[PDB]
Amino acid sequence: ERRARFVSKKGNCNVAHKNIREQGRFLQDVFTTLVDLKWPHTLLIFTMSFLCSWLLFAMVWWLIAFAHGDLAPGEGTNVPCVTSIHSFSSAFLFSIEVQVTIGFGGRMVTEECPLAILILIVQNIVGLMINAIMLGCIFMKTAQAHRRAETLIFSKHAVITLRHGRLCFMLRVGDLRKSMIISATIHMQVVRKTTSPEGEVVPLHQVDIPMENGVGGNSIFLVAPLIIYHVIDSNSPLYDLAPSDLHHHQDLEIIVILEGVVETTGITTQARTSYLADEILWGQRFVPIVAEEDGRYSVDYSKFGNTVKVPTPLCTARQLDEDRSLLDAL
């Protein structure tokens, strides 16, 4: 059959929300939903909102002139309610001018009809409100930073190898743009259907994974591609990952979530990748990537995900503690 992914290689969580007892919360956040729409879809709502608004008041202006008797054929004795309204087409054009504030002035609002003064007030309030609504939504759409996460790059498959004696699940994350992600943060989680001694069965248990940072924190400084490794100590859930059971149909997955505010806009972003069981290569290192130039460094992004073969024990980290302890005791 197939093996599902908790999160795909480009985020995009492959979880299906079902049986949602919907209380209309989808539509209550219109302003949030309006931003989530694609740009071509936003224009349709952007366009149909104005176009209906002009056409809603096009009917009002046409009805007012009809009732007042202005559109009666012939140069009548009465003063027109709104000048030069001789068709619904003229009423449509006058509807556009007032709300957009073009105001050509061949179709003025006269001082005769007080009903039109109210409608002129209403159309301006509606015009200012709708325009204010559309400005805000477009500002948050222009301030979107989800496409910035597309430039955050992870290696195709991670590795488990040797480093300072211990065994670490190494990795590589790179930033392609030149702008910085202020206050970066890395959270790694191991997802496995984990049972418990008490008898509980957790269908997808997410256990956090330390990043093996120098100060025991999450902050990273992303300028050149780095290695985000996790030292597999006695408490690491990967303490019993033998190389034998690293095959495809293994309930194993490493979620990596990189967070940080984009320096250009100030919007926080997340970049998420998952390394399945078959996407981990035991006993391989990452090639040296940062070369030196005459007065600067040089990152060979061609060699971003290249891994070489490195000698290593083919035994579990649990057997590394036992092997070291016996050797130290002897």
Partner 1 sequence: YRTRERRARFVSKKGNCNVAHKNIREQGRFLQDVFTTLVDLKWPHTLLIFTMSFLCSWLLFAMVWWLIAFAHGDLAPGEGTNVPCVTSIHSFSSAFLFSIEVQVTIGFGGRMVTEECPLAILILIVQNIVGLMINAIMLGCIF
Partner 2 sequence: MPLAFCGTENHSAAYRVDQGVLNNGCFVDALNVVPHVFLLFITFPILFIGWGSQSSKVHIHHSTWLHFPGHNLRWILTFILLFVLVCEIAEGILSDGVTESRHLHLYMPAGMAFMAAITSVVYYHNIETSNFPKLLIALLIYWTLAFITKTIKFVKFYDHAIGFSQLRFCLTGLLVILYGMLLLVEVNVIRVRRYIFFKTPREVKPPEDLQDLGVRFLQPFVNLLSKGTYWWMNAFIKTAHKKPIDLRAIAKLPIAMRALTNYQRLCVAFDAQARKDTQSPQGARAIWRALCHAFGRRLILSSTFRILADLLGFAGPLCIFGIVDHLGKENHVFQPKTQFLGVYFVSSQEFLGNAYVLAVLLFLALLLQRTFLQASYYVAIETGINLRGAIQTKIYNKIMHMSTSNLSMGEMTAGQICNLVAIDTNQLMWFFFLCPNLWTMPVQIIVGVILLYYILGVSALIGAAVIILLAPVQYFVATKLSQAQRTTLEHSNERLKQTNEMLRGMKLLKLYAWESIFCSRVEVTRRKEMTSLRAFAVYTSISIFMNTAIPIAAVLITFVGHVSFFKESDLSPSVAFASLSLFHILVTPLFLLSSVVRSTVKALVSVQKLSEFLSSAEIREEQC
Ligand X SMILES: Nc1ncnc2c1ncn2[C@@H]1O[C@H](COP(=O)(O)OP(=O)(O)OP(=O)(O)O)[C@@H](O)[C@H]1O
**Chain positions contacting partner 2, by CB under 8 A:** 176, 178, 291, 298, 300, 302
Regarding 31 and contact with ligand X (CB under 6 A), the answer is: no
Contact call for residue 134 and partner 1 (CB under 8 A): yes
For a second copy, the binding residues in 88-117 under the rule CB under 8 A are: none
Task: Look at residue 156 and give the partner it binds from a second copy, partner 1, ligand X, none, a contact being a CB closer than 5 to 8 Å depending on partner kind.
Answer: ligand X
Q: Which does 5 bind (CB under 5 to 8 A by kind): partner 1, partner 2, ligand X, none?
A: none
**146/39 Cα distance (integer angstroms):** 13
Nearer to ligand X, 139 or 297 (CB): 297
Specify the 3-state DSSP secondary structure of 138. Answer: helix
49 touches a second copy (CB under 8 A): no
Nearer to partner 2 among residue 62 and residue 304 (C-beta): 304
Considering only 31, 139, 208, 219, the residue that binds partner 1 (CB under 8 A) is 139
Min dist. Cβ of residue 67 to ligand X (A): 50
Q: Which does 200 bind (CB under 5 to 8 A by kind): a second copy, partner 2, partner 1, none?
A: a second copy
* 265/20 Cα distance (integer angstroms): 34
Residues 183-202 that bind a second copy (CB under 8 A): 183, 185, 187, 189, 196-198, 200-202
Query: Could you give the C-alpha distances from 109 to 55, 95, 121, 330, in angstroms and in order?
Result: 18, 11, 11, 103
Please give the span between the terminal C-alpha atoms of the chain, in angstroms, as a whole number.
50
The pair of three-digit structure tokens given for residue 128, joined into one six-digit string = 């200012």
Residue-wise DSSP of 52-99:
HHHHHHHHHHHHHHHHHTTTSSS--SSPPSBTT--SHHHHHHHHHHHH
- What is the per-residue binding string for partner 1 in 180-219, x denoting contact by CB under 8 A? ----------------------------------------
**Backbone region of residue 126 per phi and psi (left: phi > 0; alpha: psi in -120 to 50; beta: other values):** alpha
What token pair was written down for 173?
């994350």
Is residue 153 close enough to count as binding ligand X by CB under 6 A? yes
Does 301 help bind ligand X (rule: CB under 6 A)? yes
Q: Please classify residue 91 by burial: count the beta carbons closer than 10 Å to its beta carbon, then call 0-12 exposed, 13-18 middle and 19+ buried.
A: buried
Find out whether 101 is annotated in a ligand binding site: yes
19 touches ligand X (CB under 6 A): yes
Q: For residue 297, say whether it is annotated as part of any ligand binding site.
A: no
Q: What is the DSSP letter of 244?
A: G
Query: Does residue 301 have a known ligand-binding role?
Result: yes
296 annotated among ligand-binding-site residues: no
Q: Does 274 bind ligand X (CB under 6 A)?
A: no
User: Which residue pairs from 105-114 have beta carbons closer than 8 angstroms and sit at least 24 positions apart in sequence?
Assistant: 107/82, 107/83, 108/82, 108/83, 108/84, 109/82, 110/79, 110/80, 110/81, 110/82, 110/83, 112/79, 112/80, 112/81, 113/64, 113/68, 113/81, 113/82
Q: Report the partner that residue 281 touches, choosing among partner 1, partner 2, a second copy, none (CB closer than 5 to 8 A by kind).
A: none
Q: Which of residues 194-233 bind ligand X (CB under 6 A)?
A: none
Identify which of 208, 177, 185 has the alpha carbon closest to the alpha carbon of residue 268.
Answer: 185
Taking a C-beta distance cutoff of 8 angstroms, is the pair 131, 46 a contact?
no
Is residue 221 close enough to count as binding a second copy by CB under 8 A?
yes
Q: What are phi and psi of 304, to 5 degrees?
A: -70, -50
For CA atoms 76, 81, 83, 87, the dihedral sign is negative
Binding residues: 19, 21, 101, 104, 147, 301
**Interacting residue ranges for partner 1, rule: CB under 8 A:** 43, 46-47, 50-51, 54, 86-87, 89-90, 92-93, 96-97, 100-106, 131, 134-135, 138-139, 141-145, 147-148, 150-151, 176, 178-179, 223-224, 262, 264-265, 292-302
- Under the rule (CB under 6 A), what is the footprint of ligand X? 19-21, 153, 155-156, 176, 301-302, 304-305
